[PDB]
């Protein structure tokens, strides 16, 4: 009839411990994923950067295979666990069927792992939600999202984390077919969505793009600042 147990329904029919894990997700840095035509983009805000930190070690965009990528929001240690399991599963699927994982296959596997941890009130759910972008083996760009309960959906553009609602409103109002025509417009649309929650933009923004038949490429701060400068020019 309450929370405090993972496997107990409340009289309204709510499992509140899973919902509190999703509360844990809603505090993390905002992650924005936009699915383009031939490029798929991921962008995470670098919330409260410390100057004496190796930023390479606190990155929230990761490569699962050569075609699949993933950004997360939530508790970072849970995310590390889930990411490494997903990497092993990508390689194991390649060993099983020779074919690269479809982005749905690895999204489904990640969700099944999180769903295993939402059972058995002697375990603790993973307090992360992931944005799994990628390209299928036949070249279709994909963007999926899993959440702590083990539930995944396919999106055109999405945001998770703190300020996901404002960014998702911006994306709904601004994601069209004319914002997707080029790779550059997709990148600038992700940066513009992230600039809706990021103060002092450009230096708190972590972009990584993945073009078709190419590996994940993290954009260095110089390229990101060039894109932000282009955005301000286009503001006129």
């Amino acid at each position: 009839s309450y929370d405090r147990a993972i496997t107990v329904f409340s009289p309204d029919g709510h499992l509140f411990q899973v919902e509190y894990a999703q509360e844990a997700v809603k505090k993390g840095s905002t992650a924005v994923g936009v699915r383009g035509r031939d490029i798929v983009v991921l962008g995470v805000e670098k919330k409260s950067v410390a100057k004496l930190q190796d930023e390479r070690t606190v990155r929230k965009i990761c490569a699962l295979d050569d075609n699949v990528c993933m950004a997360f929001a939530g508790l970072t240690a849970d995310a590390r666990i889930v990411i490494n399991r997903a990497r092993v599963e990508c390689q194991s699927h390649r060993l099983t069927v020779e074919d690269p994982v479809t982005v749905e296959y690895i999204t489904r596997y990640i969700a099944s792992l999180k769903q295993r941890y939402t059972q058995s009130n002697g375990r603790r759910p993973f307090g992360i939600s992931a944005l799994i972008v990628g390209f299928d083996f036949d070249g279709t760009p994909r963007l999926y999202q899993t959440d702590p309960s083990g539930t995944y959906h396919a999106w055109k553009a999405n945001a998770i984390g703190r300020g996901a609602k404002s960014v998702r409103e911006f994306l709904e109002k601004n994601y069209t077919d004319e914002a997707i025509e080029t790779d550059d417009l997709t990148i600038k649309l992700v940066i513009k969505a992230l600039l809706e929650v990021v103060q002092s933009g450009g230096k708190n923004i972590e972009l990584a793009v993945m073009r078709r038949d190419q590996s994940l490429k993290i954009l260095n701060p110089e390229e990101i600042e060039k894109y932000v400068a282009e955005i301000e020019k286009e503001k006129e």
Binding site: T7, V8, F9, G13, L15, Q119, S120, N121
Partner: protein, 48 residues
């Protein structure tokens, strides 16, 4: 599994019975680990 073993389509009621055998196995967690430990919170409508 039914097609492999018996070379025919499983009837609607038999599919529903197999899913029910899976779905009624809650509680009793320390008996067959990997069991569910609570009722499934989903109602299904098999139409065939």
């Amino acid at each position: 599994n039914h097609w492999f073993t018996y070379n025919e389509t499983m009837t609607v009621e038999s599919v529903t019975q197999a899913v029910s055998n899976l779905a009624l196995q809650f509680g009793e967690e320390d008996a067959d680990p990997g069991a569910m430990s609570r009722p499934f919170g989903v109602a299904l409508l098999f139409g065939g």
